[PDB]
């Protein structure tokens, strides 16, 4: 049973739910999060939950407990996370979890075992008694985990915190067909109709899996990464961002991943270093997952000594995109191009994108770029 059939369709619906929640709050904020990373982390947490607390989590991740066995869900995430942690992958994607519980708590052995074997994650004990040392400790972990990529992830720890969860992911892929750094220039990026910002714009004339969809009122571009990952970008027509974010479905996205026809185009894609940081308690709470964060939370699977609820949960995503790709600076990258004037498709205004794992088609990342030069 392939990983896809166990969790992808579900991750897609989750991805959309979380995205739309953030997109409904504002049309001018940058967005970046990992559906995979966030869902895996709470699927892992559900292992220590029970009763409605447990059901509410999985049902909150768009998984129907009366259609697919909980074992399939965990086996799926296990397989996917396993592939993403492979030290030898050309993708160079690193993601991890941070489980922090107050020292002195008698932990359930079964729980810690599953978290290690199924989610390749580890638990840690910290004295929340001293809010500052606890904070330094947690950040120290993410600090060592992301090899310095993420510093001071947490900025505030409530006094009665007993359990906090940290989830992060960092990605910077290399294209199969790169851009020549020499061709990158500063260009106008239209944050809105009456405001522009200058941004380094990569550009290349070639054959691209690019086309304009009348259904989404957007140009759609697919770029393959060296490493079994594909980036797909949705450039909505003027004033059609809300339309696009509203029309996206798994079927529509899949339709694009299935078609490989290409056409000539002079592409302009902005170089970017973007991040996303979220309070999962606030976000997941709006998605129906509230009990695991409440006083009546059932986390007896984590500890039987005394009551327990998730006090803090934060997600941090980091994505970098630049010209770097394959090695063959020459005619190797010479494509057969029709000789009419090719369309100049510029990603110079707000757009949506996703990064899809090649084999499982799982949504590693989903975001929106409103202003590439500002947080």
């Amino acid at each position: 049973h392939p990983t896809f059939n166990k969790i992808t369709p579900n991750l897609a619906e989750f991805a959309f739910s979380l995205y739309r929640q953030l997109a409904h709050q504002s049309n001018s904020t940058n967005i970046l999060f990992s559906p995979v990373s966030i869902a895996a982390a709470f699927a892992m947490l559900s292992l220590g939950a029970k009763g409605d607390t447990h059901d509410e989590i999985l049902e909150g991740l768009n998984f129907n407990l009366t259609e697919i066995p909980e074992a399939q869900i965990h086996e799926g995430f296990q397989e996917l996370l396993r592939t993403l942690n492979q030290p030898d992958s050309q993708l160079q994607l690193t993601t991890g979890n941070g489980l922090f519980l107050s020292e002195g708590l008698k932990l359930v052995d079964k729980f810690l075992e599953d978290v290690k074997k199924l989610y390749h994650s580890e638990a840690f004990t910290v004295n929340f008694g001293d809010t500052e040392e606890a904070k330094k400790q947690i950040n120290d972990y993410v600090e060592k985990g992301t090899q310095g990529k993420i510093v001071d992830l947490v900025k505030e720890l409530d006094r009665d915190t007993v359990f906090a969860l940290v989830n992060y992911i960092f990605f910077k892929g290399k294209w199969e067909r790169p851009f020549e750094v020499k061709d990158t220039e500063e260009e106008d990026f239209h944050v809105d109709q009456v405001t522009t910002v200058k941004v380094p714009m990569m550009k290349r004339l070639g054959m691209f899996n690019i086309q304009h969809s009348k259904k989404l009122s957007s140009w759609v571009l697919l770029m393959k990464y060296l490493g079994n990952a594909t980036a797909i970008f949705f450039l909505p027509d003027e004033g059609k961002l809300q339309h696009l974010e509203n029309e996206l479905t798994h079927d529509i996205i899949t339709k694009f991943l299935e078609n490989e026809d290409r056409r000539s185009a002079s592409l302009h894609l902005p170089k970017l270093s973007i991040t996303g940081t979220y309070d999962l308690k606030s976000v997941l709470g709006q998605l129906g997952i509230t009990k695991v964060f409440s006083n009546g939370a059932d986390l007896s699977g984590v500890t039987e000594e005394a009551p327990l609820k998730l006090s803090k949960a934060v997600h941090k995503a980091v994505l970098t995109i630049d010209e770097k790709g394959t090695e063959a600076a020459g005619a190797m990258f010479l494509e057969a191009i029709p000789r009419s004037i090719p369309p100049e498709v510029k990603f110079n205004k707000p757009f949506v994108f996703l990064i899809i794992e090649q084999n499982t088609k799982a949504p590693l990342f989903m975001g929106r770029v409103v202003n590439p030069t500002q947080k």
Binding site: L205, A331, E335, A336, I337, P338, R339, S340, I341
Partner: protein, 223 residues
């Protein structure tokens, strides 16, 4: 056109520019009411510009005529560019003169080595972009089938032929598509595609017009 020369105003009377707010392809006038071009250049609402030299400034000899019909070859494959040929009927007949004349169709296919003239307002740089104001010209020979197939393995059909120089430096480019390849007063080819422009061992590929003379005459009669 890369590595070519300025033709000189109206020295290539059969050359036309397809415009949709700007020049995007070339074409050849075969009779007062029909223009031959490339299928991949197809677009709706095309305005055919004849008697042009400096496509940007008014010089006095141009005739702008809308395309009433744009018939793409029924077997045109947009992925392989096989059968890359298109016929455009002018809404009204053009006024033929010394600056605007039709080029005749071939009665037999040209053989390897045949020397011809290729023209257009396409990019003039093998690297980078530079569109000219005036029409550019290039003298170039049709290459052997051997070299063509060798240059583009499994990409060349019997409806295509290469022309140019294997060493590079001289070639048609983006913006020349649809344009003519004339040999001894015969339109033997249409600029179609190529890997890069004026790149070594990567000559231009052209639609073999002689294979469509029958289709052209039949289409003109039925329209």
């Amino acid at each position: 056109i890369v590595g070519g020369y300025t033709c000189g105003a109206n020295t290539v009377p059969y050359q036309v520019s397809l415009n949709s707010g700007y020049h995007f392809c070339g074409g050849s006038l075969i009779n007062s009411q029909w223009v031959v071009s490339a299928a991949h250049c197809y677009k709706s609402g095309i305005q055919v510009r004849l008697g042009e030299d400096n496509i940007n400034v008014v010089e006095g000899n141009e005739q702008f005529i809308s395309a009433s019909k744009s018939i793409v070859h029924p077997s045109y494959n947009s992925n392989t560019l096989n059968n890359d040929i298109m016929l455009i009927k002018l809404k009204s007949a053009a006024s033929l003169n010394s600056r605007v004349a039709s080029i005749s169709l071939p009665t037999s296919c040209a053989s390897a080595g045949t020397q011809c003239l290729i023209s257009g307002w396409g990019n003039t740089k093998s690297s980078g972009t530079s569109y000219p104001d005036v029409l550019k010209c290039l003298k170039a020979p049709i290459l052997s089938d051997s070299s063509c197939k060798s240059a583009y393995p499994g990409q060349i059909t019997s409806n295509m032929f290469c022309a140019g120089y294997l060493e590079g430096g001289k070639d048609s480019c983006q913006g020349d598509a649809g344009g003519p390849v004339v040999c001894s007063g015969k339109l033997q080819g249409i600029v179609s595609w190529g890997s890069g422009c004026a790149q070594k061992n990567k000559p231009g590929v052209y639609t073999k017009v002689c294979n469509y003379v029958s289709w052209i005459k039949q289409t003109i009669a039925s329209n």
